[PDB]
Amino acid sequence: RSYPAIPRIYAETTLNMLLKRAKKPRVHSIDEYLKDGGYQALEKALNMSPEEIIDWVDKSTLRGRGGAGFPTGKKWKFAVQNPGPRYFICNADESEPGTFKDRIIIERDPHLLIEGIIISSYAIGANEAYIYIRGEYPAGYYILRDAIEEAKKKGFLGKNILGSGFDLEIYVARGAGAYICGEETALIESLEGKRGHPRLKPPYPVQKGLWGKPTVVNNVETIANVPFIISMGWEEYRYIGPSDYAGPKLFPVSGKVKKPGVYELPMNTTLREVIFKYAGGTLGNKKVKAVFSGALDCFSSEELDIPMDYSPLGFGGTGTVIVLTEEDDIVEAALKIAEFYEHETCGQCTPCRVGCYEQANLLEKIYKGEATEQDWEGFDFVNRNIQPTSICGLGAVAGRLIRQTLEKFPEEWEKYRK
Amino acid sequence: SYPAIPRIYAETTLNMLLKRAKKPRVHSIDEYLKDGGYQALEKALNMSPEEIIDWVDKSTLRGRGGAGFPTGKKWKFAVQNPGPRYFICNADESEPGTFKDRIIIERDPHLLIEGIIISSYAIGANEAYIYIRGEYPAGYYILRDAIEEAKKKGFLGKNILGSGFDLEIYVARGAGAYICGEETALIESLEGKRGHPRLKPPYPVQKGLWGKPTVVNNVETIANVPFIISMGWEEYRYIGPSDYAGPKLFPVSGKVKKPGVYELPMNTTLREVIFKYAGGTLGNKKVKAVFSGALDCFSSEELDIPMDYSPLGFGGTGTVIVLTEEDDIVEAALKIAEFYEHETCGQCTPCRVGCYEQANLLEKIYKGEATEQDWEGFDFVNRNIQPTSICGLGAVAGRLIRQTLEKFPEEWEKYRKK
């Protein structure tokens, strides 16, 4: 079974969990997964009550890996307080600039994700689950379809799984080019066969989701932790990394580093360690100027000693690390972030629709040296006014990184204004 | 960081094997990829092993480790025998004057690695070795690192680029024995034993490592394989004379102005190598002789020969050691005798005793301490090293020295007077 060409992203782990197989850049099929003890966490889970699985996942302190860090167990608990039927959704839309951590699980160790989906579905009483994978991951789509068939043949999916009385089918849906379809409610709209337009939240999907039914949406990486939590127990899982923010975490590192790729590391690792200890330091040993946390935040070279955790002073986000060095023009980089938001607003909300557009249009004039005084003042105003009335996170953050560059790199911006 | 290596001069008229290795530094995988590296492997993996064998056969590539056996034919002999099969790259390069292979290893390791992978695929070997002499520590570390890069990029390991072809390359080190360049002694050494040549036949392609079909090829031979696949066998065969086609490396040393490695077509003459490429002689002194490593001695009357594998050509490995008019031929012969004394493995009686006595007696002659019986003994010994020999060393230990006795009788006769 041949697949489309995929570039061979470098992957390194100090924990040997999520990347025990995915550190090798190829598809690991079900026999190889089984030889490594795979699906024995599922078997164990089916001998447990759903309520006990939720409890372990709660006690593990697992938090959402899709960017917001919501406690996973708490999320599941909320879903099961509502009458069924319920649905489970794996979010594989991964489209934020700099972020490529989820695809290496999907493309190299799909059974880790499948096993996590089955356990999670059982935990919340869902008999129908979905993977929503972005359209620009065609190989991941075919790999997952094939892996799901392998799992069916070995009796891990279908009716009455391993004699447990639990039924599950996993359907694989494809996106078709919209970053906003990673927002969980827009994702659900897309699964329902519509345009990807976020819904007002609350209600959260766990109350009202797919077809208005209780729905848990979790990120690929979040789900990939679930087999480990069942396999080793929650106590041992909490002994991974710092007691405060336990567990393995994937860090997709790119830009001006010697060893760009995905690193599996504990969350007490600092940003400086990620860059210098793990990713080989900078190209040309040039000084770090900035790190972009995807398209969300901009950290300066004075902020490299922060931990890669979900604490208030920590890196947070998805652990996406894009490294800019001393030669890299911050205004040019800010323009690329503005262009992303321009291209990805869904346009339901007026300040988001016109603000994302104007932010990019005006910043392009600034960059090219064609901005009037009014264009400069307009740019500053628009950047501060994308968020009002927004119903989803995109409008709330479309100006965030750019504002941070204005605050942290005033000298470079001032050169453009002159 | 790698151990210090002298910066051997390298020059090419063909820009193939020395396209990168003309610059005295390590070229890592990114530089190699920028030059189209590993695209030949990708092409090869879309071909049948049988077609690769056919291409290498029709290219006319001949062994570069000294004997000139047709490479495609060697592969064909291996694949007519049941597997598993092994592929060995011979990097033992220890003959006096010979330093051509190291510059590929140390400067363009990926060229060699790419060739090893293609060749292994062609013969159905899933395990390959490089056997590198112990006195090339930098080359060893460079290759170990380059193999790891190839693994990162998916050119080694299981299911290489989705082909279903598996390969690991292991790097072994020698430990001081020239005889471990003889392919059967090399295999004994890979098996953890002393480097004792085996009676052949059988040839390694019938019975080799662990008694299984094994292809041994020289570094330089293997480095041609990517070009044959990239260019096609017809275009490759267009390089140089149609009966001895392709690039050849010529390690030139001794009394020339520009000693180094020259990549040239095999219609080049020995005179051209010395005077057109290597800058002529030190002090513009007359050429007295050229030693083809420790194998042959050509006089100044023999410089118009082609640097090919023809009966009247230079042959060997194209190793060119230049002696000029004031260099004492008997002193030079003594150094050749000392080499064979040091390198006989001792299994065969005439080789064991003959290599020792040839050097022992020639030392006496050189120092003016030889009796009449020592002179007569020396002549007899020189003619009687080969009988019962099981490998090429015993067959050639007297060859160069005999040629000096025939071509420079006047100089020898001066040692007879004293």
Place this chain on the structure above:
Amino acid sequence: FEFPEELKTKLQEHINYFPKKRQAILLCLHEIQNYYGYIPPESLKPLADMLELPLNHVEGVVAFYDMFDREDKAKYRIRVCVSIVCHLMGTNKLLKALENILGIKPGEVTPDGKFKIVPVQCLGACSEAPVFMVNDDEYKFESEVQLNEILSRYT
């Protein structure tokens, strides 16, 4: 306008795959684009019928989702990432190489209808910047010589 049987069969498989027919809309549109080299405007009124959806629903979905193209037929879509990391690491070198080899710029189709360059947002392979796809195949761009050889595999 009528879908040929082999395509109509594949569409039916998608429609039968999910619990509700309308969930198959994106898989169907990908299939149509794969088949024709674009989304024929005339294909939408028979597709809506198969999905039991109004035509304007289907039109609205085609317009929303950036991967779909109703304007230009092309055998091979060369998707070039223009987002931050690829920009930093050499998008412009990749585009210059493509123009040197193919004679076209982003948004353009070669006169033979063989290649279209499509500028896209981050492809999720940023460590391999600058990234491009050729239809479903994805690659790191290293150099013009390397790219020329890659492109020659598409005939």
Place this chain on the structure above:
Amino acid sequence: EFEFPEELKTKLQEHINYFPKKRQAILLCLHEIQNYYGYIPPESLKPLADMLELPLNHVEGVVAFYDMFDREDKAKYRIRVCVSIVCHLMGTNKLLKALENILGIKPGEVTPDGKFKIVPVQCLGACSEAPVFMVNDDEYKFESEVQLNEILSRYT
């Protein structure tokens, strides 16, 4: 009982696990031992034989066979001097004289501090850069006594 320090033992195991069969690692292990100790200690061969699952006389025969290994003399730095044809023609004897001037020793000898041993070797495969020597893994062309003195000053 002689035992390998843990840090050496670890490296030896890595070699033993590297190849498909344990006995293939014998030379890499012997290199590692000589690196660590400055020579091959006679007492080190049994433990190594046990680790390779080989008879001791097999290991002893291998050490005897391979010229890079030295069971006699401990030296921190091995100065390998090529004595083959091309280096001979181009100035091996000048290099040996320079080494005697700087270090007070001749081929086969160790300095009284155990720091340097001169080891005469066959062709090192750098003949265009004759006369050639190595200092442990580093390899150089000899140009002159002043140059050699500067090179040797880097090894402390």
